[model samples]
Target chain A: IVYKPVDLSKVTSKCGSLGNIHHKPGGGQVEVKSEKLDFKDRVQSKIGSLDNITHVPGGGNKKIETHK
Target chain B: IVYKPVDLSKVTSKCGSLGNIHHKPGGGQVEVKSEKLDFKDRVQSKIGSLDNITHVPGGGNKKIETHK
Candidate 1:
């Protein structure tokens, strides 16, 4: 069973316009295609980049919260 | 770490009101209890019904987009 993936570039573009885009569960190599910044800005914007701060049962482990 | 699962029925209720609801990562035993339609209409509304037209890495995989 395959799932449709979100366009990170589009999301990041929209998010960058709003505020910042922080990737949670932060170890994966996500590509951002926006011309606004480089990997440093992206890395600096991240708080913890960890996974699942809120612990719930049964659901898979990762919760990303967006703040403005 | 764990997370809360998105309520399929609630999402479907919202999506059904606007348009069609197509599940991505497509297969799951989702139960929809809305009186507006049955499983057949749910199945028919699907187009290609596959996954990931837009790809972004390190983001796990599943991405669902809403269209109006």
Candidate 2:
């Protein structure tokens, strides 16, 4: 079981991908996989305390809710 | 005062549900509410530092904007 540790410091910085696989809309989508590693369940357990980490299982993609 | 200390352990597992009210789209929608608890204001205060925790006051539902 590999644990991906998410760097909170990078979250706000210009380089924080948030441990997700991003799919940008264009000719091809860019997947920004989160560098933060941990057990799937271990990471899910800390959802509330760690930060907002929403995962869409299977091949379903996750979306970001941006304000303004 | 009930301070629901979010267990970061459960967040990454099959048993973890982030402290959020999720509204799934189906007949109506799934509302996945967050289990992690803290003062509403306090949570808002740490928005910049913490992960994405968006709160919609009154009766406004938050929307997730997908990258792709």
Candidate 3:
């Protein structure tokens, strides 16, 4: 995959109203509709490789420590 | 703001459990805790400029429309 930003303008058109629909919120709450094309998941998967995160376990503490 | 991926490993340690806490899910389902540092918002805001998205009105159905 590439790091280039996806052309959301094109994608929005292709996915009909189901894509790239940004609900402009006023002073009230903001909400988005269901992503029919899994837009977010794909974006995450595309750039997902950039991070190599792993759990450090519960051992490293006091310079770190556990609650119990 | 830059495009570099934030080091989740370091961030995980810094925000304590409130940061990059990846809760390992089995075959069941996956879930994420509340983002204490507004991590997602900041990241979006950073690279947010990369996408110059604007909402096109409900008009412009057929052929090419919107954009310069």
Q: Name the docking class for model 2.
A: incorrect
Global CA lDDT computed for model 3: 0.23
C-alpha local distance difference test of each model? 0.24, 0.26, 0.23
Report the lDDT tens digits of candidate 2 across residue range A1-68. 33333322211111112333323212222222234332322222222222444433222223243322
Query: Which stretches of candidate 2 lie above 4 Å from their native place?
Result: A1-50, A53-68, B1-50, B60-68
lDDT, candidate 3, at B10:
21
Q: Which tens-of-lDDT digit does each residue in A9-52 have in candidate 1?
A: 21211110112233221233222223332232212222111122
TM-scores, all candidates, are 0.12, 0.13, 0.13
Best by DockQ: 2
DockQ of each: 0.02, 0.04, 0.02
lDDT of 3 by residue, B1-68 (tens): 22322222221112112122223311212222223221222123111101222232322223222221
Judge candidate 2 at residue A20 and give its lDDT.
Answer: 38
Candidate with better TM-score, 1 vs 3: 3
Error of 2 at B45 (Å): 9.5
> Judged by DockQ cut-offs, is candidate 1 incorrect, acceptable, medium or high?
incorrect
Model 2 error, position A23 (Å): 6.3
- Tens-place lDDT per residue, model 3, A1-68, is 22222222221112112222223311222222232232222123111111222232221212221121
